[PDB]
Design a protein around this ligand. Structure first.
Ligand SMILES: CC(=O)N[C@@H]1[C@@H](O)[C@H](O)[C@@H](CO)O[C@H]1O
Ligand SMILES: *[C@@H]1O[C@H](CO)[C@@H](O)[C@H](O)[C@H]1NC(C)=O
Length: 246
């Protein structure tokens, strides 16, 4: 399992957590020196448990599918909660079975559905360490509309930061002040599957993407990534979604 405490958190302890989160995901091969997540994992070992503690020391445990860093659901005291989608129903066969009750949230875990539930796109929702403290708190007691925004903050400050060193750094810059994500951050989130696939297709194509990926850079400028020499590939991305899942 991995753990993160908001009480006393700072950039260093958050970076320790994101390192532990990346290290908890199994991989047998690296592609262009980036860990390649597994095609599949059977049974309970598919799910990583992340123990998150708010500033007061209250906790939720979040289950994450290790093949794709997707959060499936979470446990808060004696209640489990899962997205309304078959992968999360499957996960509920393995994790948090000791909960006294299981609630299926009234949306799936994808960004489009969560933003509809929350009433706002993630361009407008601040993220940071304080926002993560608020999100954990929100999730302690059921409120499906509030939970959708909390889950948009939780997914970006845990999974997305694990996938991309740029997003990890964005959250560290927001350790004591939330701020909406940069458009670069949104672009990377939306591009993770495409980048993961193109980096894998470049292995028998001399390092060249079969199809360019368009990203927004740190200045708001839209840019084409065409091969593995780009800084997105050599520096930023940390985990590849296996093409078997794309
Ligand atoms: C950890 C998690 O659940 N993450 C996903 C994010 O990976 C994905 O791009 C988005 C789909 O739009 O859905 C969120 O659920
Ligand atoms: C590869 O990537 C860089 C941009 O990072 C670009 O300048 C270069 O000319 C590209 N080369 C090919 C072969 O696509």
């Amino acid at each position: 399992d991995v753990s993160f405490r908001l009480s006393g958190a700072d950039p260093s302890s958050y970076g320790m957590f994101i390192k532990d989160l990346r290290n908890a995901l199994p991989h047998t091969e690296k592609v262009y020196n980036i860990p390649l997540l597994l095609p599949s994992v059977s049974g309970a070992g598919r799910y990583l448990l992340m123990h998150l503690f708010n500033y007061d020391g209250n906790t939720i445990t979040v289950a994450v599918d290790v093949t794709n860093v997707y959060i499936m659901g979470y446990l808060a005291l004696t209640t489990s909660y899962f997205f309304n989608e078959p992968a999360a129903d499957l996960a509920s066969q393995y994790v948090f079975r000791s909960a006294r009750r299981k609630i299926t949230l009234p949306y799936s875990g994808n960004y489009e559905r969560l933003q509809i539930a929350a009433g706002k796109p993630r361009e407008k929702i601040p993220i940071g360490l304080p926002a993560l403290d608020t999100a954990i708190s929100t999730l302690l007691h059921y409120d499906s509309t509030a939970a959708a925004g909390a889950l948009l903050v939780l997914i970006q400050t845990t999974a997305e930061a694990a996938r991309f060193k740029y997003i990890e750094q964005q959250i560290q810059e927001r350790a004591y002040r939330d701020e909406v994500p940069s458009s670069a951050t949104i672009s990377l989130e939306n591009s993770w599957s495409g980048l993961s696939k193109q980096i894998q297709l470049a292995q028998g194509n001399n390092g060249v993407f079969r199809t360019p990926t368009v990203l927004v850079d740190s200045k708001g400028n839209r840019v084409q990534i065409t091969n593995v020499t780009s800084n997105v590939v050599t520096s930023n991305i940390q985990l590849l979604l296996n093409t078997k899942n794309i």
